[PDB]
Design a binder for these strands. Structure first.
Lengths: 57, 57, 57, 57
DNA sequence: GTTTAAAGCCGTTTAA
DNA sequence: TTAAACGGCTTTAAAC
DNA sequence: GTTTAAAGCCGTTTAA
DNA sequence: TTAAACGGCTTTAAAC
DNA sequence: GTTTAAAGCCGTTTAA
DNA sequence: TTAAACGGCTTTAAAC
DNA sequence: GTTTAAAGCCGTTTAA
DNA sequence: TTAAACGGCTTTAAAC
C-alpha cells in the first residue's frame, strides 16, 4: 500500500510541537490514514452516495 | 497549516474502492490527520517521551 | 457531564485482556465517548437526517 | 460481548442535541467503544505497562 | 567509549 | 515547475 | 433495562 | 380533488 | 518498612 | 426486577 | 501539484 | 409528449 502522507511535512509539524519522529512512526500514521478512509467509504455508501465528503471522515 | 496528504494518491485509492472525491474532501481528511497527530503528541508526552512512535497514533 | 459507560463492565473486559484500569481511566474513556457521539451528530446533520445511525459513529 | 454503554443516558444526550436514536445506533456505538479500548490496550502494552491510563484511549 | 536511534545535510530524480 | 523522497554520512544524545 | 402497547411522523395510494 | 389508510420506525410511559 | 495505587469484598440504594 | 455504583477496608505489589 | 478547458452526469423546465 | 438546455460538480488530460 502506497504512502498517502507527506513524510517531510509530518516530521516538520511534529518537530514544530517540540518532538522527534521514530523511524517507523510515519508508516504507523499511514496505516491510521487508510483506516480513516475505509471508515469514510462505509459512511458514504451507508448514505447511498458515490462521492466522499469531508463529513464522511 | 500545510497539506500532510498526497491528494492524487488518496483520490486514486478512493476511486479504486469505487468512489468519487468531493472538491473539499481532502481538506476534511487533512483536518482529521492533524487531530490524530495532536492526540499522538499528548500520548508521547504522557509517556515521558520526546519521540513519537507508531503506537502513539 | 454524566458517565455514559458501565465502569464495572469496562474494568471486567480490560481485566479479561490481562490489564488493570487506572483510577481516572474510565473518566478518560467517557470523554472519548462524548467526542465520538458529537462527531456522529455532525455526520447525521450533514446527511440532512434527524436520526443517528450506527454508520454515523 | 456485553454492552459497555448506558443506553438511556446516550439516547437522552443525543435528544438534548436535537436528534433521535435509531434502533441499532447504540449497538454501533458499542462496537466503536470496544475498538477504542482494544486500541488503548495495544498502547498500554507498547509502553511496557500493565495499567490502562486515560492517555492510552 | 560504546551502542542505539534520530536529526541534519547534500545532491539527484521522480512524483505531485 | 517544484518539492519530496531517498540513501549515505556525520553529528548528537543518553545511560551504563 | 425490559416488556407491552399506544402515539406520532412520513410518504404513497386508493378510496370517498 | 382530497384525505384516510397503512406500514415501518421511533418515542414514550408504567411498573417491576 | 514504607509509599502509591489498584483490586477485591461487602452491603445498600438508585438507576437502567 | 436487577445490576451498577459507591465508599470503606484490607490486600497486594514494586522498588528503594 | 497546478492551471485551463472540456466531458460527463444528474435533475428540472421549457421549448420544439 | 419528449428532448434539449442548463448550471453545478467532478473527472480528466497535457505540459511545465
Amino acid at each position: 500500500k502506497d504512502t498517502l502522507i507527506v513524510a517531510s511535512k509530518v516530521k516538520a509539524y511534529i518537530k514544530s510541537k517540540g518532538f522527534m519522529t521514530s523511524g517507523d512512526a510515519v508508516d504507523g500514521l499511514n496505516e491510521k490514514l487508510y483506516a480513516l478512509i475505509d471508515d469514510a467509504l462505509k459512511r458514504t455508501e451507508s448514505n447511498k452516495r458515490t462521492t466522499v465528503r469531508p463529513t464522511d471522515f
